[PDB]
Design a protein around this ligand. Structure first.
Ligand SMILES: [Mg+2]
Ligand SMILES: [Mg+2]
Ligand SMILES: [Mg+2]
Ligand SMILES: [Zn+2]
Lengths: 294, 286, 154, 166, 150, 44, 221, 110
């Protein structure tokens, strides 16, 4: 089959092929009227470009403070990525970490760090061993950590990562943070998604599950750098939002008879909500405990 | 307001000079500038080089293909055949082919031990755009060159220079033209080193192959000199020994670099391109 | 060597310092919210807290009435102290006033503060509020707190 | 007097070729005859030099100097001028490229001293100049590292020749 | 002074004189006045000297333009591209001839300070000196106070 | 880039909890060293 | 600046009117084609006769060709900013409209084809001797393909495309000073029908700010 | 004492442009969540404080009208009411100040 280096190249070309395909559907530069319904600067109307302008571009019209503070956008009462192009006239609201009820933002950050960890895991092991990403479980933030289900090669059945191995994952994740790669989002049909992830059995089942729920059978694809994954919802704009990041521990899920599923875990905090050294150690201890989704 | 005119006039010229420095005019062809006679300059071109050029051939050498097409376009725009002007493509091909053969003959006789790979790169270097254009600009070839775009592109100028040689080849012959190539292209290797002109990769690998052709055992690299090994400014002299006999030695800041330098020194001695080699004989042939 | 000195040096002297604080204190009682330079408000804040304590002694106390007579230059505020402010803080043992820093004064760029008696009828000051318990950092700590209590019971 | 700064917004560049890169929008604005000292205005102009348009306003708003309000007012009317007149899409996509103060025309007044002597005081005036360039602010120059110092030193040692000889 | 002026190393144009000698002077442009009193020597040079000078320098194109001018000048252009303008204002015929001949003999390089009165691309034949040139070698290349086979 | 302190982002409920948490840990750590001779002391 | 100094014999000489004497409302659905009619024609004929009085050698049929040449040359002056020639082609009411918004911008306008021949839709004249001057306005219907490409002060594309012509249907109003012996027919203004399709959208995005509320004020729906 | 020599601009630039004499960039600036205007972390928002002061000034003017002169401080508590509001059970026996405007959203009735 395809080598891991070639596998990413095929996915990126297919991902870019669909992205440019959707761009051509836009007739010239059609204008849309985006009304700001937030508490601050009420009544502001943005005359943006359909399928081209993003909520971040709307924030650039207001000030730099909106660009830095806004993590997620609320379009017609629905979560919206900051870099997801707007498709119609709508009402926009900007959400931050320090809102009264930042429930959607917390889900987006947790869904974003899980993807970042998933990128680290795939490129961490040597080419001799096979790594298959299963999914990113939707665990609550109050659980103390975000988790990612990973199935490794059969050779790594009796092997558990050491403390130095866990620190190796943390350094790789911090390199991803340093790169400051924006989260590129793209909503595609189920058929396109299956072709991209045709080499992985777990993703195909995951994509089919997402497509079945939606009447139009459309799934959301997110990419940072060269890593493409299927996400349950909107993500943070850029990887630079994360400030403290660390992979806590790895646990083997049960039963192991059909297949050995390993659950990587970690805890992260953004720049806006960075904690003290003493407090950060306390959160690390809780993140190492196994988390069970309910 | 002081009386006078000379002081005000003198200051105006100073202001004009400063304005030119602040906003330099774009360069223009010497032909467009005043005091230019193309026919007079063509004749002086041959006399400076002490060559009996043919005026009919020499003028066609400076006529480029782009200039002819641009001239035809201008006539169509103005709605104005008399433009049956021959380009320099034929002369350039003759000049380029002769120059490569002439340079190959000179280098083969001067360095019989140099392989065909080394000779070809030296000929390509001498006929390269960087060397040819440098000679062409300083021989007033660029001023006489008729081109659509100014300054003349290096690709176009190189073609013009070889057209001049081609015109000289028909005017005087191969014997006279060889001296012209010797006096202006061979001279370009005066201070240049062998590997500064012939760029190579992994000289040690090439050295081993050369010794096999000469039935010589593989060289052995050893440290002959060493200074400041544990410091930030080391010195190493790596010597290459064949049958426990020194063939070359080279300095370097690291053992790997010094060993690579020694391979280059060995290649120079084998190929005859030593720094203290016999200088080129520019004297008149007997 | 101002080691252990707890009283600021303001006004034209010691007596002028008391009169300056008394005018601020008298203005504070009448309007229940005044603004002044930060140092003077901080110096006056201690006296405002102790003035309410004298009000809790009752108007029948001669010493309390004498203290209220001196510090309230407008005699209509003396009934207000013993019948409005003092009954207001009957169930409070302290913290009668809140002091907050406002932007600097426009004229001399002086550090300005606003001091008010808690429970006044005026519109509330924009008090600083801590981050909501639903933030990402607070949710993680809440989960940690729940884990410890569960382990303690077990 | 000279008013060359106001004339720098009247330069019309030729249209760009389709392959040419986007040219950042340059906006020149200034305020003449400010009742302030150019020496005191220099520190405020130096403070916001290189900052973004929004960060410069934030720093000036909470600065106790009198010229901070004056400079902030100049930036506010320059920021609006960029979008309204100079075809800038996002009003926040600007940074302070140039910002400096210059001496203006001043008036001389007499100050009376003792013993019948006097000194001449000047009513100082200053000009504030600002240049706005469209785009994110340029990143600050990283500090010189030990690798850069060592590389530069070795290059110095490798460039020295035998002097006063052949 | 030397510090306040630029400097260069001694050099030639296209290694002139190595294979053959090429006259670096390429063009001379004279500007004489028909009636100008300061151009009297310039007119004398044109009448009898420039014609013979052109015979001796077939490779130099000389342009003589007679136009009204207060200060006659001669412009010398060289193969390397340098342009030098010299005034012949109120100069005798002999002084002009010396100046014109001086321009023909120059290579066209900048007339500034030359650091070394010599130039060589091969300064060494036997090998440039290095600290180990006169240092003998020791058996097995042992450094001072070094023990072999410990 | 802005500076921060330990209880800047803590909520009203968390501040008493964090103070109690760190204070209890400090007392536990100090109480754990009360028997130096039972924790492999160096030779006397 | 509104009024010159009072009690002066010299008065400002205007070379054109400020507006349209009687606005011509085009019929709805006229673009799809690409009793009252007689009354409008009769009114137009009366104004034509008065025009022919001052200029006997005047023909209505030749005007649309003449109007087309004036329209093309007037807009071509904007490409090279030839304001000297533009004044001879447009009136003083039309000159500020054409040139005020393009002073620091580069305009590349071209004429491609004429889809339909120009038709004169209305010829009318002002009231006789308003101030000793009589003006005549002619409205010409033009349906031609044009190419526009406006660049901003920095040479960046701002509006339109340089190689894609589009259909334009506009009603150009011309005006001439009949009393002036040296007067000539010049463009006066344009009529924009209410039913005209909206123009092509601009390239950049624009933010429309909301009301700026004082602290005492509050936002209302 | 008088200067012995004139200090050069090179010497003066070093003193004037020293980092100790340069303005320090502030890092405690944040956006006020209520109005979106800037504020310092330890300082009340200027826009919001002005909003409260504007309403406070109107209330105090209405207080003076009821008092109708100096030395008229009441011996009972005060309650501010707006249009469409009536006194509550806990507001009985307290001085009532009426404002001819709708109650502000940020001014919660107690
Ligand atoms: Mg003290
Ligand atoms: Mg004092
Ligand atoms: Mg003075
Ligand atoms: Zn606020």
């Amino acid at each position: 089959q395809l080598s891991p280096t070639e596998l990413t190249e095929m996915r990126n070309d297919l991902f870019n092929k669909e992205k440019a395909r959707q761009l051509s559907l836009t007739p010239r530069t059609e204008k849309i009227e985006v009304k700001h319904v937030g508490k601050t600067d009420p009544g502001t109307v943005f005359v943006m470009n359909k399928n081209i302008s993003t909520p971040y571009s709307c924030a650039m019209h207001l000030s730099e403070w909106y660009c830095r503070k806004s993590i997620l956008a609320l379009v017609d009462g629905q979560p919206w990525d900051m870099y997801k192009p707007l498709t119609k006239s709508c009402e926009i609201k900007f959400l931050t970490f320090k809102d009264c009820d930042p429930g959607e933002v917390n889900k987006a950050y947790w869904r974003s760090c899980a993807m970042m960890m998933g990128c680290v895991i795939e490129r961490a092991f040597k080419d001799e061993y096979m790594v298959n990403l299963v999914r990113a479980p939707e665990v609550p933030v109050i659980s103390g950590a975000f988790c990612y289900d990973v199935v490794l090669d059969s050779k790594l059945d009796e092997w558990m990562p050491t403390k130095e191995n866990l620190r190796s994952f943390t350094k790789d994740a911090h390199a991803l943070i340093y790169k400051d790669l924006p989260f590129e989002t793209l909503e595609v049909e189920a058929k396109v998604a299956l072709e991209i992830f045709q080499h992985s059995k777990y993703k195909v089942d995951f994509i089919e599950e997402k497509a079945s729920q939606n009447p139009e059978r459309i799934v959301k694809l997110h990419r940072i750098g060269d890593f493409i994954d299927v996400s349950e919802g909107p993500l943070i704009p850029r990887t630079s939002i994360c400030f403290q990041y660390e992979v806590s521990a790895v646990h083997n899920l049960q039963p192991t008879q059909p297949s050995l599923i390993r659950r990587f875990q970690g805890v992260s905090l953004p720049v806006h909500l960075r904690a003290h050294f003493t407090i950060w150690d306390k959160l690390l201890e809780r993140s190492r405990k196994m988390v069970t989704e309910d | 307001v002081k009386k006078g005119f000379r002081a005000a006039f003198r200051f105006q010229k100073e202001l004009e000079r400063q304005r030119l420095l602040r906003c330099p005019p774009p360069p223009v062809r010497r032909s467009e500038k005043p005091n230019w006679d193309y026919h007079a300059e063509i004749q002086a071109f041959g006399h400076r080089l002490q060559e009996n050029f043919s005026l009919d051939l020499l003028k066609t050498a400076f006529v480029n293909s782009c200039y002819i097409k641009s001239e035809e376009a201008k006539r169509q725009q103005l709605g104005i055949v008399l433009l049956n002007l021959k380009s320099n493509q034929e002369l350039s091909e003759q000049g380029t082919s002769f120059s490569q053969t002439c340079l190959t003959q000179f280098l083969e006789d001067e360095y019989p031990d140099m392989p065909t790979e080394g000779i070809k790169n030296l000929v390509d270097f001498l006929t390269g755009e960087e060397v040819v254009c440098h000679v062409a600009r300083n021989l007033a070839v660029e001023q006489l060159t008729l081109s659509e775009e100014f300054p003349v592109p290096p690709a176009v100028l190189q073609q013009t220079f070889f057209a001049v040689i081609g015109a000289l080849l028909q005017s005087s012959g191969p014997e006279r033209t060889a001296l012209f190539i010797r006096d202006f292209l061979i001279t370009q290797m005066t201070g240049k080193e062998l590997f500064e002109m012939w760029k190579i990769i992994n000289p040690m690998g090439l050295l081993v192959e050369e010794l096999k052709k000469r039935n010589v055992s593989a060289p052995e690299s050893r440290l002959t000199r060493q200074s400041g090994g544990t410091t930030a400014l080391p010195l190493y002299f790596v010597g290459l020994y064949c049958d426990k006999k020194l063939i070359a030695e080279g300095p370097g800041e690291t053992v790997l670099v010094a060993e690579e330098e020694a391979a280059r020194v060995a290649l120079r001695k084998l190929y005859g391109f030593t720094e203290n080699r016999r200088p080129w004989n520019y004297s008149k042939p007997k | 060597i101002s080691h252990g000195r707890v009283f600021r040096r303001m006004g034209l002297g010691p007596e002028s310092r008391i009169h300056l604080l008394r005018n601020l204190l008298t203005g504070l009682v009448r309007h229940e919210r005044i603004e002044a330079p930060w140092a003077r408000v901080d110096e006056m804040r201690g006296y405002a807290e102790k003035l309410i304590d004298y009000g809790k002694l009752g108007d029948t106390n001669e010493r309390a009435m004498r203290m209220a007579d001196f510090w309230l230059t407008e005699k209509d505020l003396i009934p207000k102290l013993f019948q409005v402010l003092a009954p207001r803080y009957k169930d409070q043992t302290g913290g009668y006033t809140r002091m907050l820093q406002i932007p600097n004064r426009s004229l001399d760029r002086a550090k300005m503060a606003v001091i008010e008696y808690k429970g006044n009828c005026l519109p509330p000051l924009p008090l600083p509020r801590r981050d909501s318990h639903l933030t990402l950092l607070n949710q993680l700590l809440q989960g940690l707190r729940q884990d410890l209590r569960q382990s303690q019971e077990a | 007097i000279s008013r060359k700064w106001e004339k720098k917004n009247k330069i019309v560049y030729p249209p760009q070729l389709p392959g040419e890169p986007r040219r950042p929008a340059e906006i020149y604005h200034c305020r003449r005859q400010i009742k302030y000292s150019k020496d005191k205005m220099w520190y405020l102009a130096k403070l916001i030099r290189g900052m973004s348009i929004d960060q410069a306003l934030a720093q000036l708003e909470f600065n106790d100097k009198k010229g901070a309000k004056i400079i902030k007012e100049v930036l506010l009317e320059a920021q609006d001028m960029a979008v309204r007149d100079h075809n800038v899409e996002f009003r926040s996509n600007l940074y302070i490229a140039e910002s400096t103060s210059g001496r203006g025309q001043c008036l001389k007044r007499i100050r009376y001293h003792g013993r019948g002597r006097f000194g001449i005081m000047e009513k100082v005036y200053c000009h504030y100049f600002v240049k706005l360039v469209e785009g994110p602010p340029p990143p600050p120059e990283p500090p010189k590292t030990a690798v850069a110092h060592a590389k530069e030193y070795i290059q110095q040692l490798r460039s020295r020749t035998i002097v006063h000889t052949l | 002074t030397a510090r306040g002026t630029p400097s260069r190393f001694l050099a030639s144009v296209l290694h002139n004189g190595l294979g053959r000698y090429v006259q670096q002077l390429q063009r001379l442009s004279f500007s004489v006045s028909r009636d100008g009193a300061s151009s009297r020597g310039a007119r004398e040079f044109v009448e009898r000297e420039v014609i013979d000078f052109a015979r001796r320098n077939p490779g130099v194109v000389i342009y003589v333009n007679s136009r009204p001018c207060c200060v006659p000048r001669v412009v010398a252009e060289y193969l390397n591209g340098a342009v030098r303008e010299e005034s012949i204002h109120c100069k005798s015929v002999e002084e002009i001839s010396t100046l014109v001949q001086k321009l023909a003999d120059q290579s066209g390089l900048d007339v500034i300070r030359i650091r070394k009165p010599f130039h060589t691309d091969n300064p060494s034949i036997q090998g440039q000196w290095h600290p180990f040139t006169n240092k003998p070698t020791t058996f097995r290349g042992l450094r001072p106070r070094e023990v072999q086979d410990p | 880039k802005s500076g921060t302190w330990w209880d800047e982002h803590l909520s009203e409920e968390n501040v008493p909890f964090i103070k109690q948490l760190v204070s209890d840990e400090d007392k536990a750590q100090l109480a754990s060293k009360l028997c130096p001779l039972k924790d492999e002391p160096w030779p006397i | 600046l509104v009024i010159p100094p009072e009690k002066s014999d010299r008065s400002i000489h205007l070379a054109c009117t400020a507006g349209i004497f009687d606005a011509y409302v085009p019929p709805e659905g006229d673009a799809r084609i690409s009793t009252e009619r007689m009354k409008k024609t009769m009114a137009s004929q009366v104004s034509i006769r008065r025009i022919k009085d001052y200029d006997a050698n005047f023909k209505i049929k030749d005007f649309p060709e003449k109007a087309k040449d004036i329209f093309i040359e007037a807009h071509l002056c904007l490409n090279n900013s030839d304001h000297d020639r533009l004044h001879t082609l447009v009136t003083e009411h039309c000159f500020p409209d054409m040139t005020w918004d393009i002073k620091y911008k580069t305009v590349r306008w071209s004429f491609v084809e004429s889809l339909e021949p120009s038709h004169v839709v209305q010829v009318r004249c002002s009231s006789m001797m308003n101030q000793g001057n009589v003006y005549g306005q002619i409205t010409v219907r033009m349906h031609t393909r044009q190419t526009l490409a406006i660049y901003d002060r920095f040479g960046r594309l701002m509006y339109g495309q340089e190689d894609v012509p589009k259909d334009v249907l506009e009603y150009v109003v011309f005006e001439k000073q009949l009393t002036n012996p040296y007067g000539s027919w010049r463009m006066h203004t344009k009529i924009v029908p209410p039913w005209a399709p909206p123009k092509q959208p601009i390239l950049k995005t624009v933010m429309i700010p909301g009301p700026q509320l004082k602290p005492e004020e509050e936002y209302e729906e | 004492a008088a200067p012995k020599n004139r200090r050069t601009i090179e010497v003066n630039r070093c003193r004037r442009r020293n980092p100790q004499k340069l303005i320090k960039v502030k890092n405690n600036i944040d956006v006020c969540p209520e109005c979106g205007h800037l504020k310092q972390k330890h300082v009340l928002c200027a826009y919001c404080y002005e909003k409260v002061c504007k309403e406070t000034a109107e209330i105090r003017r209405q207080i003076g009208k009821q008092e109708g002169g100096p030395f008229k401080a009441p011996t009972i508590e005060t309650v501010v009411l707006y249009t469409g509001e009536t006194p509550s059970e806990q507001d009985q026996g307290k001085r009532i100040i009426e404002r001819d405007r709708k109650r502000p959203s940020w001014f919660t009735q107690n």
